[PDB]
Amino acid sequence: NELFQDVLNGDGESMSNTCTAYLKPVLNSITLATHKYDEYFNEYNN
Amino acid sequence: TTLKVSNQQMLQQLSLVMDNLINKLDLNQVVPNNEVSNKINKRVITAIKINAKQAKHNLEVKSTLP
Amino acid sequence: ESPSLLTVIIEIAPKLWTTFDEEGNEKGSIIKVLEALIVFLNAHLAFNSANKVAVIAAYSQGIKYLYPESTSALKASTRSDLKIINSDMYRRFRNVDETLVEEIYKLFELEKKQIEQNSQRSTLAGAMSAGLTYVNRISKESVSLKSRLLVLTCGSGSSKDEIFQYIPIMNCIFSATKMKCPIDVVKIGGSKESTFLQQTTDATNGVYLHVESTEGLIQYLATAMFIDPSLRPIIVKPNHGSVDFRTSCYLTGRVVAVGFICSVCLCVLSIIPPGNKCPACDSQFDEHVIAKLKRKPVVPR
Amino acid sequence: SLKHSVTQYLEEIPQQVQNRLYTSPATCLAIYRILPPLAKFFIMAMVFNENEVPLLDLDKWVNSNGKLQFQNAIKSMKSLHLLIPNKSSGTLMINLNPTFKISLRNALTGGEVQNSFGVVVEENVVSLDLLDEYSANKWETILHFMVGTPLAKIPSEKVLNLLKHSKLMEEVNSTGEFKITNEGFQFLLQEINSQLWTLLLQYLKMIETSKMDLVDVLHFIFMLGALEVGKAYKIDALSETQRIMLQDMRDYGLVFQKHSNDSIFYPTKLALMLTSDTIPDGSLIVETNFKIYSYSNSPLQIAVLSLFVHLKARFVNMVLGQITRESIRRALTNGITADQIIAYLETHAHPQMRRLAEEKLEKKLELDPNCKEPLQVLPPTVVDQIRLWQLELDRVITYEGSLYSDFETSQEYNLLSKYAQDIGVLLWKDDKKKKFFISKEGNSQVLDFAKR
Amino acid sequence: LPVNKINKGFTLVKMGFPTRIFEDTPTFCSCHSKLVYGGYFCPNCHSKVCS
Ligand SMILES: [Zn+2]
Ligand SMILES: [Zn+2]
Ligand SMILES: [Zn+2]
Incomplete structure (x- = not known):
């Protein structure tokens, strides 16, 4: 997220899309991992 | 996991193929009628445009990033 | 630049083509696809003088070569000059087309003799193996020659995907990869997705082509199937809908996600087999590793 | 070579003559095989649809690896007039030639x-017993007239003036012999398919009269390419230009007839050889002592080795010769360059020379890997001797023209010298000696420049 | 090599079949941390691999 703002005030959206697309797959990977952890946490809570 | 055809229709279809094969096997009928040829060409050009856009580009590659 | 061999593995089956005639508005579609094949073969022979052509028809009882003819019939020719194609065309085209249509005549008569037996076994894989053996003979007999395969299969919305064609066709792929011989597939029928032939034409650097209408097929064959092996690397391929290279489970048959195989016979299982025994190789499995896999992952409270 | 020459002759043909050519299927089928493979693929892509195809689509067909090849194919497309470009709605679209399609x-x-x-x-003879050795005998007698050996049989006067009008076979009548040029040895050097093409294209450039037509000769040549050997053909579909064409190609060896004025003609193996191609005989062993041990039994290779090797003996399998000085002097007075001689020796070398060249190059690369050397199939001593014998003929060179001097002013001399240099006729100028030389072809220009 | 009869390590192996992705924008691979145009999305963690 800070990198998603670090370029945002850096070059002004002519460059943030490239960095976002470069870091997309690892972002969906950690998002899926955190979502799986959260849903197993809610499953064991219930 | 995510039509039944009888032998008499089978045999009469084969006999129709036989009489269509014996009499005159006119090859010039393969030429399309200037519309289905255009549709087939349009589909092939769209498919090869998709494949060329995907396969235009495939040590790491150079990037615009500093 | 370099002469080539074109082998057409045409799958002619009266049940499949009858179902295609019933599904389509037109009748006698095998005549149209045979006409398109004949004009395509004449085009390939016109591409280069030293080019060579072979055809294998796969029928419900097996396979049969169509060009070149059975060598005893070549030695006997007896006189069998049927007037199916006119004699005033180019002679090298004329010999090939007449041999092909005479073999079509003989094959349809032979299968009409054997129409009483309905076969549940498709012979496309054996025909592809025979075509690859022909490619080997032509490659090592004459010193080099590029080569190509063409498969004109029909599903007609009736014949689904078949498990028994998984093992042979796959092996054919590797042999094709051994000889740098692309395997090109034209599927005529309502089944838009045919997994095994798509994996074949993707792994052999070929082109897949699913069409729904037999009319205008020569446009398709001379547009996309006319990639001679001398210009394969410089032509981008029109194969749309890239195949996923997955496989099917053994006990459920569904397309497989993250899954399990045995270390003995490599069969894919989407779920743990009951009885702790592999369904194919019949090997006994220890309780420890399957208890580890069946165990849930941890999460804190 | 082979495709380039016929392609160049095809662009030399005007566009309307090309459109008149493209009527019959035989010449279009033969021309289609001359194209590059990508050009052939585009032709077969555009033949079966009756609508024009944009150039952007054909650009999209070709991958990024061989784009220039595509341009080369397009250049062939822009050369044989196979496409009509059309500027419609701001787009450059391509239509196939309608007659050709x-x-x-x-x-x-x-x-x-x-x-x-x-x-x-359906009245034919077996090719090997009659037609093969007929075409062979015609080709060997014309190529033995080519090499200049004495013969008991000489061909007709038409191939004689074919050679007289040709750049090869220079002629003298005060002596009584016909001299081979450098182009003659180049003609002997290449393969028989290119030999047939050079002979037929020169026969094409000869003819301009109304006796025979250009479209008829083109259609008949490509049809003889399209026929098959071993089966005979009949006559009335041919024109009178094409009956006298049957006469001329029977004289040359392309076609067999049993007698003159017959209606049934037999194509030979040379007609099928015309379109495309398909220890060796004539392979020779050369040593450091300039000896020639040639595995040749046909008179052709012996006779063509007699041009530059003093032959000493002949067996059924062996021909014994020596690379003497005077034989190479005869070859150079025949205009044969040493490079063509070295080429004829290396392409006809013994396979033992080739293999020994690979062990010698392996010893060289394991000896001096820092540099790479060509596969010297012949020893370098005989090659050096041949090139010295080449150089010793043209040690002294005489240029014929005129010399101008005796100028009282250096400005006039400099003006005349720079005028001669501007028109490219000067060979020497010297202000200290005040003399400049000009060529024979440029004498008149300097003469009427000085007169005016 | 052929295995012996006494060996009883007849074990299930958990694996996934990745999907070949097609993107016109290069991305960071998870194995070498470099730009690769293609890649195979892993079915378990949605990360991409080179080979
Ligand atoms: Zn197993
Ligand atoms: Zn993973
Ligand atoms: Zn990697």
Whole structure:
């Protein structure tokens, strides 16, 4: 997220899309991992 | 996991193929009628445009990033 | 630049083509696809003088070569000059087309003799193996020659995907990869997705082509199937809908996600087999590793 | 070579003559095989649809690896007039040539051909017993007249003035012999298919009269390419230009007839050889002592080795010769360059020379890997001797022209010298000696420049 | 090599079949941390691999 703002005030959206697309797959990977952890946490809570 | 055809229709279809094969096997009928040829060409050009856009580009590659 | 061999593995089956005639508005579609094949073969022979052509028809009882003819019939020719194609065309085209249509005549008569037996076994894989053996003979007999395969299969919305064609066709792929011989597939029928032939034409650097209408097929064959092996690397391929290279489970048959195989016979299982025994190789499995896999992952409270 | 020469002759043909050419299926089928493979693929892509295709689509067909090849194919497309470009709605679209497309589709699918591929009369002889050695005998007698050996049989006067009008076979009548040029040894050097093409294209450039037509000779040459050996063909579909063409190609060896004024002619193996191609005989062993041990039994290779090797003996399998000085002097007075001689020796070398060249190059690379050397199939001593014998003829060179001097002013001399240099006729100028030399062809320009 | 009869390590192996992705924008691979145009999305963790 800070990198998603670090370029945002850096070059002004002519460059943030490239960095976002470069870091997309690892972002969906950690998002899926955190979502799986959260849903197993809610499953064991219930 | 995510039509039944009888032998008499089978045999009469084969006999129709036989009489269509014996009499005159006119090859010039393969030429399309200037519309289905255009549709087939349009589909092939769209498919090869998709494949060329995907396969235009495939040590790491150079990037615009500093 | 370099002469080539074109082998057409045409799958002619009266049940499949009858179902295609019933599904389509037109009748006698095998005549149209045979006409398109004949004009395509004449085009390939016109591409280069030293080019060579072979055809294998796969029928419900097996396979049969169509060009070149059975060598005893070549030695006997007896006189069998049927007037199916006119004699005033180019002679090298004329010999090939007449041999092909005479073999079509003989094959349809032979299968009409054997129409009483309905076969549940498709012979496309054996025909592809025979075509690859022909490619080997032509490659090592004459010193080099590029080569190509063409498969004109029909599903007609009736014949689904078949498990028994998984093992042979796959092996054919590797042999094709051994000889740098692309395997090109034209599927005529309502089944838009045919997994095994798509994996074949993707792994052999070929082109897949699913069409729904037999009319205008020569446009398709001379547009996309006319990639001679001398210009394969410089032509981008029109194969749309890239195949996923997955496989099917053994006990459920569904397309497989993250899954399990045995270390003995490599069969894919989407779920743990009951009885702790592999369904194919019949090997006994220890309780420890399957208890580890069946165990849930941890999460804190 | 082979495709480049016929392609160049095809662009030398005007566009309307090309459109008149493209009527029959045989010549279109033959021309289609001369194209590059990407050009052939585009032709077959555009033949079966009756609508024009944009150039952007054909650009999209070609991958990024061989784009220039595509341009080269397009250059061939822009050379044989196979496409019509059209500027419509700001787009450069491509239409196939309608006569060519119709003719090629008639060739492929069949239909009307107007008997452009001949018809069999089902009266034939086996090729090996008659036609093969007929074509062989005609080719060997004309190529033995080419090499200049004495013969008991000489061909007709038409191939004689074919050679007289040719750049090869220079002629003298005060002596009584016919001299081979450098182009003659180049003609002997290349393969028989390119030999047939050079002879036929020069026969094409000869003819301008109304006795025979250019479209008829083109159609008949490509049809003889399209026929098959071993089956005879009949005569009335040919023109009178094409009957006298049958006469001339029977004289040359392309076609067999048993007697003159017959209606049944037999194509030979050379006609099938015309379109495309398909220890060796004539392979020779050369040593450091300039000896020639040639595995040749045909008179052709012996006679063509007699041009530059003093032959000493002949067996049924062996021909014994020596690379003497005077034989190479005879070769250079025949205009044969040493490079063509070295080429003829290396392409006809013994395979033992080739293999020994690979062990010698392996010893060289394991000896001095820092540099790479060519596969010297012949020893360098005989090559050096041949090149010295080449150099010793043209040690002294005489240029014929005129010398101008005796100028009282240096400005006039400099003006005349720079005028001669501007027109490219000067060979020497010297202000200290005040003399400049000009060539024979440029004497008149300097003369009427000085007069005016 | 052929295995012996006494060996009883007849074990299930958990694996996934990745999907070949097609993107016109290069991305960071998870194995070498470099730009690769293609890649195979892993079915378990949605990360991409080179080979
Ligand atoms: Zn197993
Ligand atoms: Zn993973
Ligand atoms: Zn990697």
